[PDB]
Amino acid sequence: ASRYLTDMTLEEMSRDWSMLIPKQKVAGPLCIRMDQAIMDKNIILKANFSVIFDRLETLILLRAFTEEGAIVGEISPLPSLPGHTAEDVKNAVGVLIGGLEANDNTVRVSETLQRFAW
């Protein structure tokens, strides 16, 4: 039975959001979205992962938040894909980070993601 470990509240995970200037691009088996309008902000990446034998398994959802809690980025798995690897996830995360930093934002990652990296 798969459980889930998440950095986010129910509301943070279910909130609808839209991008002022949309960008949506596939990175491997994952969909990355980011608001290209966002600049000079401190941004935090938060994730929900399935958990299997006390081990972080697959990425269910990642969202990027400004300090005011505005969603400015997202990583979702492609629904039609059988699955993804850890490397796939880390690749997608790096792509999002690069995109946000290309717009002069400082990006940090949650405790959960910092562990997933290794």
UniProtKB/TrEMBL annotation:
<keyword id="KW-1048">Host nucleus</keyword>
<comment type="function">
    <text>Inhibits post-transcriptional processing of cellular pre-mRNA, by binding and inhibiting two cellular proteins that are required for the 3'-end processing of cellular pre-mRNAs: the 30 kDa cleavage and polyadenylation specificity factor/CPSF4 and the poly(A)-binding protein 2/PABPN1. In turn, unprocessed 3' end pre-mRNAs accumulate in the host nucleus and are no longer exported to the cytoplasm. Cellular protein synthesis is thereby shut off very early after virus infection.</text>
</comment>
<keyword id="KW-0945">Host-virus interaction</keyword>
<keyword id="KW-1103">Inhibition of host pre-mRNA processing by virus</keyword>
<keyword id="KW-1088">Inhibition of host RIG-I by virus</keyword>
<keyword id="KW-0899">Viral immunoevasion</keyword>
<dbReference type="GO" id="GO:0030430">
    <property type="term" value="C:host cell cytoplasm"/>
</dbReference>
<keyword id="KW-1192">Host mRNA suppression by virus</keyword>
<keyword id="KW-1114">Inhibition of host interferon signaling pathway by virus</keyword>
<dbReference type="GO" id="GO:0003723">
    <property type="term" value="F:RNA binding"/>
</dbReference>
<keyword id="KW-1113">Inhibition of host RLR pathway by virus</keyword>
<keyword id="KW-1262">Eukaryotic host gene expression shutoff by virus</keyword>
<comment type="subunit">
    <text>Homodimer. Interacts with host TRIM25 (via coiled coil); this interaction specifically inhibits TRIM25 multimerization and TRIM25-mediated RIGI CARD ubiquitination. Interacts with human EIF2AK2/PKR, CPSF4, IVNS1ABP and PABPN1.</text>
</comment>
<dbReference type="GO" id="GO:0039540">
    <property type="term" value="P:symbiont-mediated suppression of host cytoplasmic pattern recognition receptor signaling pathway via inhibition of RIG-I activity"/>
</dbReference>
<dbReference type="GO" id="GO:0039524">
    <property type="term" value="P:symbiont-mediated suppression of host mRNA processing"/>
</dbReference>
<dbReference type="GO" id="GO:0042025">
    <property type="term" value="C:host cell nucleus"/>
</dbReference>
<keyword id="KW-0694">RNA-binding</keyword>
<keyword id="KW-0922">Interferon antiviral system evasion</keyword>
<dbReference type="GO" id="GO:0039657">
    <property type="term" value="P:symbiont-mediated suppression of host gene expression"/>
</dbReference>
<dbReference type="GO" id="GO:0039580">
    <property type="term" value="P:symbiont-mediated suppression of host PKR/eIFalpha signaling"/>
</dbReference>
<keyword id="KW-1190">Host gene expression shutoff by virus</keyword>
<keyword id="KW-1035">Host cytoplasm</keyword>
<protein>
    <recommendedName>
        <fullName>Non-structural protein 1</fullName>
    </recommendedName>
</protein>
<dbReference type="GO" id="GO:0039502">
    <property type="term" value="P:symbiont-mediated suppression of host type I interferon-mediated signaling pathway"/>
</dbReference>
<keyword id="KW-1102">Inhibition of host PKR by virus</keyword>
<dbReference type="GO" id="GO:0030291">
    <property type="term" value="F:protein serine/threonine kinase inhibitor activity"/>
</dbReference>
<comment type="similarity">
    <text>Belongs to the influenza A viruses NS1 family.</text>
</comment>
<keyword id="KW-1090">Inhibition of host innate immune response by virus</keyword>
